[PDB]
């Protein structure tokens, strides 16, 4: 009856995750006037993103920038780099300026080799990828100003060598306690729910 | 009855740890107008953290800055570096200045390889991470001045190469004796409580 257990876990996830949230894609555009003799850009990656509502008043939300990096040798030697977010008004005025410093998680060369060996099947079939997801937490608790709503955000990374695939500006209501495991640790939720439902069945 | 033993250990932890404490996260922002052509920042990590209570009168408190470092080759070769904390008033006046010298715990290359091999599963699955937690103890018996409260702290690290993930400014009641094992050695408390409750059960 593991089929019924899987269906019950799926229904559990669907019911307890009606996430009222928005995932704005971030498109970094560069400058390209240099000689390009080295693997370094010209100017810092910048991006205007428009949210056009979700950012209403009273409810708190957590503004983050989920950032997808490759575990390339250029990224491990890059080191610390600064991420800046500037929410803007309708007329261009800045609402709230933030700043964070984010850096790639360090794993030893032997650890990388062992990861490549053991997770080889998922990497070969395209399920897994040798990438890092950094959740730059731009705002631990956001509350919108009543008079001037947030039209969008300008996001900047102050690194001329930061190899990356893409970026998301996820905004989600701060309600976490009931969904904390599902909001942060999905695989454990799947394991626990499937086991509990199978034992019940 | 290991189920009941685990439940009893959890109840033990909940009852004996009603930690009246705050964990203000520190957000280090840099200056990035320099060349930045090498793996080194331009200026020292500095950060303002606000606390707006908890810092009340009479009870002694322990102010520490739990600092999270990677065991990267850039951090092992770094050596000693200075940490400065300055509590400020509402008007900007400094309450109490403190300074410490903190350095990453040294482990030999053979020890690092052995750790990577034996703790490989926890590092692969995401449980463990090759990181150091330095408990820079800024204040051992903090007691608040009666007339002027502590609005917040400005924290600085005087290293242009210190690779780090984040930082917390944890303040907690100095009462340790009964909770000493749970205060400093949380892992052993699990074994002790589980074994004691299982033997009792």
């Amino acid at each position: 009856l593991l089929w019924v257990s899987v269906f019950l876990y799926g229904s559990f996830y669907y019911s307890y995750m009606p996430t009222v949230s928005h995932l704005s894609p971030v498109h970094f555009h560069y400058r390209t006037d240099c000689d390009s003799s080295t693997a370094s850009l010209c100017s810092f990656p910048v991006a205007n993103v428009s949210l056009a509502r979700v950012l209403m008043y009273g409810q708190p939300y957590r503004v983050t920038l989920e950032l997808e990096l490759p575990e390339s040798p250029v990224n491990q030697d890059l080191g610390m780099f600064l991420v800046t977010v500037s929410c803007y008004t309708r007329g261009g005025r800045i609402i709230s300026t933030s700043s964070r410093s984010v850096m790639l998680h360090y794993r030893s060369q032997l650890l990388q080799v062992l990861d490549t060996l053991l997770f080889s099947s998922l990497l070969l079939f395209g399920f897994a990828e040798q990438k890092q997801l950094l959740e730059v937490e731009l705002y631990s608790d956001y509350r919108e100003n009543s008079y001037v709503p947030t039209t969008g955000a300008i996001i900047e990374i102050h690194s001329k060598r930061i190899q990356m695939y893409g970026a998301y500006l996820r905004i989600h209501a701060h309600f976490t306690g009931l969904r904390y495991l599902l909001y942060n640790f999905p695989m454990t939720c799947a394991f626990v729910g499937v086991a509990s439902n199978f034992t019940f069945l | 009855l290991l189920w009941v033993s685990v439940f009893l250990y959890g109840s033990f932890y909940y009852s004996y740890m009603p930690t009246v404490s705050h964990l203000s996260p520190v957000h280090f922002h840099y200056r990035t107008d320099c060349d930045s052509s090498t793996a080194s920042l331009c200026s020292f990590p500095v950060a303002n953290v606000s606390l707006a209570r908890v810092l009340m009168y009479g009870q002694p408190y322990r102010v520490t800055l739990e600092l999270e470092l990677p065991e990267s080759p850039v951090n092992q070769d770094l050596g000693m570096f200075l940490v400065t904390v300055s509590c400020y008033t509402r008007g900007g006046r400094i309450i109490s200045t403190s300074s410490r010298s903190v350095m990453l715990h040294y482990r030999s290359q053979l020890l690092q390889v052995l750790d990577t091999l034996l703790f490989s599963s926890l590092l692969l699955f995401g449980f463990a991470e090759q990181k150091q937690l330095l408990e820079v103890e800024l204040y051992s018996d903090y007691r608040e001045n009666s007339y002027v409260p502590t609005t917040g702290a400005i924290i600085e690290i005087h290293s242009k190469r210190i690779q780090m993930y984040g930082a917390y400014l944890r303040i907690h009641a100095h009462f340790t004796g009964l909770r000493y094992l749970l205060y400093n050695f949380p892992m052993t408390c699990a074994f002790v409580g589980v074994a004691s409750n299982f033997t009792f059960l």
């Binding site: 904390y180 626990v192 509990s196 034992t199 019940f200 | 189920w3 439940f7 959890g10 909940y14 449980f127």
Partner: peptide, 21 residues
Amino acid sequence: LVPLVSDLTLSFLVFWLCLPV
């Protein structure tokens, strides 16, 4: 993010669901 920081209270009941389930 450590796996046991704010879910101990949930662990007092979700794990306790081992009784009815």
